[PDB]
Amino acid sequence: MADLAECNIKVMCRFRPLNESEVNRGDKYIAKFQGEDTVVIASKPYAFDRVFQSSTSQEQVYNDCAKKIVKDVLEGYNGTIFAYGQTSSGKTHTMEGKLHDPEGMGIIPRIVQDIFNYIYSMDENLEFHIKVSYFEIYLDKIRDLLDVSKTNLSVHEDKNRVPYVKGCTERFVCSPDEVMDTIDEGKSNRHVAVTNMNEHSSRSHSIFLINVKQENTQTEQKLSGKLYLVDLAGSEKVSKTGAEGAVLDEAKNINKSLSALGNVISALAEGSTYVPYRDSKMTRILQDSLGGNCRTTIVICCSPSSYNESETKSTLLFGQRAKTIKNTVCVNVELTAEQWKKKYEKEKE
Numbered sequence: 001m002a003d004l005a006e007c008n009i010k011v012m013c014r015f016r017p018l019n020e021s022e023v024n025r026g027d028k029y030i031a032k033f034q035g036e037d038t039v040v041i042a043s044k045p046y047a048f049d050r051v052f053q054s055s056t057s058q059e060q061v062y063n064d065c066a067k068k069i070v071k072d073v074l075e076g077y078n079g080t081i082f083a084y085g086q087t088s089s090g091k092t093h094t095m096e097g098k099l100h101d102p103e104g105m106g107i108i109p110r111i112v113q114d115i116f117n118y119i120y121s122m123d124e125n126l127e128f129h130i131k132v133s134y135f136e137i138y139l140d141k142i143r144d145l146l147d148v149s150k151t152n153l154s155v156h157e158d159k160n161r162v163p164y165v166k167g168c169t170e171r172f173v174c175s176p177d178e179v180m181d182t183i184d185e186g187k188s189n190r191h192v193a194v195t196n197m198n199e200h201s202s203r204s205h206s207i208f209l210i211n212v213k214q215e216n217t218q219t220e221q222k223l224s225g226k227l228y229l230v231d232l233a234g235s236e237k238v239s240k241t242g243a244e245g246a247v248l249d250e251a252k253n254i255n256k257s258l259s260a261l262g263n264v265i266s267a268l269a270e271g272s273t274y275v276p277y278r279d280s281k282m283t284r285i286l287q288d289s290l291g292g293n294c295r296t297t298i299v300i301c302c303s304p305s306s307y308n309e310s311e312t313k314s315t316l317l318f319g320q321r322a323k324t325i326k327n328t329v330c331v332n333v334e335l336t337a338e339q340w341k342k343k344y345e346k347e348k349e
Contacts, residue, residue, distance in 0.1 A: 107229060
């Protein structure tokens with residue numbers, strides 16, 4: 001529980017609903033509360049130590065988030081970020097956090113620019129080296145397509161107990177434009193596409209690692225570790241089932257990894273005496289990376305729709321899956337005689 005130590009960042013959740021489109025369709029959404037620290041959620045069990053809503057104001061949450069992940073890189077061994085959401089929230093715009101124009105940019109742009117800012121302000125004595133790698137995982141292949149060849153990643157317990165970039169995909173990258181291209185031009189093309197709003201995200205999650213060092217030649221010979229941003233996607237098999245094969249991996253690989261990951265985060269935070277692994281692909285690769293040996297940030301984004309209520313529930317379900325169903329009743333204590341909200345601001349008496 002420290003900036004340079006294992007920390008859940010109080011499970012940050014940003015569920016920004018989509019207006020205009022939903023309004024035109026006449027679809028309602030579930031959201032009654034403010035967007036700061038602690039908020040009020042429907043009578044069903046909820047747990048958000050730290051949560052933001054439309055009040056996020058973009059810059060207020062992104063600025064804070066970037067600092068939290070950057071700081072663990074400087075002092076903490078590694079920096080890991082988890083992000084779960086659905087195409088409804090907008091994977092490209094919301095979860096990816098890619099702003100078409102700088103101004104309260106999201107997580108991805110901040111990593112590229114915020115970190116680079118330090119690089120530009122680098123000292124002559126200090127030596128900086130930046131390398132990036134991208135990996136893709138599907139149940140059917142189980143191998144990363146980034147290398148252009150079917151291969152499996154391997155981790156060695158001898159020196160760092162961390163996964164090694166197989167295929168030498170960690171090619172040196174210095175310019176920000178070069179890393180930008182890998183994010184969309186190479187990553188998207190290599191990733192398997194499926195008929196859906198989100199070709200890659202809707203069928204599988206995406207994980208990539210960034211190797212950056214702020215080491216100095218004489219004293220800080222070795223400093224910093226790796227930065228990670230994971231896009232968790234794939235709703236429960238419920239509802240849709242005709243897909244069969246398409247839903248098979250979503251209900252199997254994604255579901256299994258999702259549950260195991262929840263166990264890894266929850267069990268470690270609670271202080272469980274058992275070592276995590278569950279023979280899961282995601283748990284094994286991030287066993288030591290997310291084994292409590294470094295600070296991590298949790299990101300939860302989901303847009304609640306009228307008919308997408310189940311997805312909203314799944315948003316909280318992340319860490320709450322087992323504790324979300326108990327004899328617990330939640331009511332709004334701060335209720336007042338004054339009307340909470342109105343259709344139009346204008347009021348006549």
